[PDB]
Amino acid sequence: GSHMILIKLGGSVITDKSEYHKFNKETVSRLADEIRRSGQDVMVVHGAGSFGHVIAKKYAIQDGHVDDGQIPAAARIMCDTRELSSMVVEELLAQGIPAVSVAPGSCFVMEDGKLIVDNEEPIRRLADLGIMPVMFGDVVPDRKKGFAIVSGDQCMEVLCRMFDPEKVVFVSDIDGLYTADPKTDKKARLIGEVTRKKLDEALTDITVADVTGGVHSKMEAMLRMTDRNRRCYLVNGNAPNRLYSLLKGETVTCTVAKGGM
Amino acid sequence: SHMILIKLGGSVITDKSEYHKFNKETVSRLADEIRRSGQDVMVVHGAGSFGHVIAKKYAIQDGHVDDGQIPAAARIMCDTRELSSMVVEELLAQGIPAVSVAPGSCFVMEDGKLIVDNEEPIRRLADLGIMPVMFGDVVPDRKKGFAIVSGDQCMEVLCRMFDPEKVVFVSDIDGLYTADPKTDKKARLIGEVTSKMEAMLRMTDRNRRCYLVNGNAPNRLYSLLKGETVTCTVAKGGM
Numbered sequence A: 001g002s003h004m005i006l007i008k009l010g011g012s013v014i015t016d017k018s019e020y021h022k023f024n025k026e027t028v029s030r031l032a033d034e035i036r037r038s039g040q041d042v043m044v045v046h047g048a049g050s051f052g053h054v055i056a057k058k059y060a061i062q063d064g065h066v067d068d069g070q071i072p073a074a075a076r077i078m079c080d081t082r083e084l085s086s087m088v089v090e091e092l093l094a095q096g097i098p099a100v101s102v103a104p105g106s107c108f109v110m111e112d113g114k115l116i117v118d119n120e121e122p123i124r125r126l127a128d129l130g131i132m133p134v135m136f137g138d139v140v141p142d143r144k145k146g147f148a149i150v151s152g153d154q155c156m157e158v159l160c161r162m163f164d165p166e167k168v169v170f171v172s173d174i175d176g177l178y179t180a181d182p183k184t185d186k187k188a189r190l191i192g193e194v195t196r197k198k199l200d201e202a203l204t205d206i207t208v209a210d211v212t213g214g215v216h217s218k219m220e221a222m223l224r225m226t227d228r229n230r231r232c233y234l235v236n237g238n239a240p241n242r243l244y245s246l247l248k249g250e251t252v253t254c255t256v257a258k259g260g261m
Numbered sequence B: 001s002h003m004i005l006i007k008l009g010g011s012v013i014t015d016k017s018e019y020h021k022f023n024k025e026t027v028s029r030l031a032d033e034i035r036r037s038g039q040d041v042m043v044v045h046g047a048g049s050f051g052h053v054i055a056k057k058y059a060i061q062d063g064h065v066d067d068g069q070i071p072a073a074a075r076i077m078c079d080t081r082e083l084s085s086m087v088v089e090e091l092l093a094q095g096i097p098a099v100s101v102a103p104g105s106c107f108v109m110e111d112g113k114l115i116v117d118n119e120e121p122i123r124r125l126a127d128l129g130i131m132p133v134m135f136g137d138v139v140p141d142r143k144k145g146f147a148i149v150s151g152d153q154c155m156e157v158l159c160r161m162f163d164p165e166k167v168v169f170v171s172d173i174d175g176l177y178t179a180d181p182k183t184d185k186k187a188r189l190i191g192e193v194t195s196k197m198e199a200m201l202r203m204t205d206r207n208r209r210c211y212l213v214n215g216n217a218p219n220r221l222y223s224l225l226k227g228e229t230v231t232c233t234v235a236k237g238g239m
């Protein structure tokens, strides 16, 4: 029975998603301070954001190795993501939280979606030493393909099964899960609770307005981080002291998922 | 088949006496000499002042003995990963795709030996054309909590793994001497080797040789990679 909270710092918060290689030092500094002020044992995962998505879109890194022109682009992403992780760890180090960057593209491989972690000793030993192992979204060598992209969500799934955290927190730049896109649609209302029946009901699309199933995908990503016990919270990292309050256990504006899968 | 294993020592790529001081101008030139050589290489680099300064300060070489070392070891880990990012940036600028592989995040150690239980990741990176770059770092130890792996230890592991054609050690000396060059200029230069002489000689066998070249001398590493004879120290014969 661990008392650990597994947190994901989405790339849309720690980075300016619209400006390549832009770091929101201000925001990550406050979030790290909120994590320290909470006094909770945590494990941090962060996304790539602008430190990965801008190049991955131009050279189609997600589709794998098709031409030799993506090799310099793939190497640039891995340098950018490791540089971004340095900026995240620096904020944690300044808050008295010893951590270390663990780049998945240099430790693990991928196979049809699964980020394969065959050796758990380095991460487990670093966690036993008090140095928080920080995994992040990265370009990872694939087996059936040349390279593949791992997201912060997938790094969260691996550490979730490895350490069995008591709570999972998703830190995004929005108030939570909505019935549509708030940055586009305004008629959408935040979804407060996410369960299995709502995930199954999310497959219904009478007017055919969510073809890609974005709401269903975001719901499933939260439920798979939940047990019969463990809960998952999607909180706005741009709201000052909101993550701190969530880590203290008090009620905040967020999206809660429970029940498990 | 024709790969050359090169270690960019911390004495040239950093200012060993000034903490967190990167030699950007020197590293870019060495990377340009690697690109101009046209040879397939696998680059290792040391930590220099990005590790040794804080390591000696907190006795990291002795292992985990007190809680005050854990924040120090994490600071060294961040420094080495930040130094490797600067080294990779110079490699990417020279059209050499490479990626940092921190031994403290991938492997473990036991009795002063770097243990690599999984070779698939670093090999698939080399197969993709993205040169995996290891470096001196603090690594979780199996008996001391943590330990310090050197750039030379990363060279020995990568040598037996990929079986390079040539081993080159890049430092601020012209080669091995009978004494310390900085504190003793009367020392004589050693040309061929058939304590650190056995470290170079154990990485050679049959035709593969191990060289120790001056990275501060412009175009000396380039000429060595081109096969020309330069001022250096070479081990021959094998063990």
Ligand SMILES: Nc1ncnc2c1ncn2[C@@H]1O[C@H](COP(=O)(O)OP(=O)(O)OP(=O)(O)O)[C@@H](O)[C@H]1O
Binding pocket: B008, B009, B010, B011, B012, B045, B046, B047, B048, B136, B150, B151, B152, B170, B171, B172, B173, B175, B176, B177, B178, B179, B180, B181, B182
């Ligand atoms: N007999 C000797 N031969 C060569 N160097 C010597 C000798 N005696 C003392 N030294 C000192 O050792 C230093 C060599 O640096 P060293 O090889 O430890 O660093 P590096 O290989 O460049 O980087 P790294 O820290 O990654 O190994 C020289 O600066 C020199 O002053």
Ligand SMILES: Nc1ncnc2c1ncn2[C@@H]1O[C@H](COP(=O)(O)OP(=O)(O)O)[C@@H](O)[C@H]1O
Binding pocket: A009, A010, A011, A012, A013, A047, A049, A171, A172, A173, A174, A176, A177, A178, A179, A180, A181, A182, A183, A214, A215, A218
């Ligand atoms: N149904 C939805 N509910 C809430 N937010 C959504 C939805 N669809 C799209 N978004 C947008 O997606 C963004 C998050 O992007 P993404 O990269 O998927 O996650 P992260 O925030 O971890 O980077 C949010 O800023 C939000 O505006």
Ligand SMILES: C=C(C)CCOP(=O)(O)OP(=O)(O)O
Binding pocket: B010, B045, B046, B047, B048, B050, B051, B052, B055, B076, B135, B136, B137, B138, B148, B149, B150, B151, B152
């Ligand atoms: C964490 C540290 C200090 C690694 C040092 O590696 P080096 O390759 O610079 O080590 P030496 O050979 O100089 O001992």
Ligand SMILES: C=C(C)CCOP(=O)(O)O
Binding pocket: A010, A011, A012, A046, A047, A048, A049, A051, A052, A053, A056, A077, A137, A138, A139, A149, A150, A151, A152, A153
């Ligand atoms: C290499 C990339 C783009 C990883 C992206 O990870 P994410 O920010 O969690 O979606």
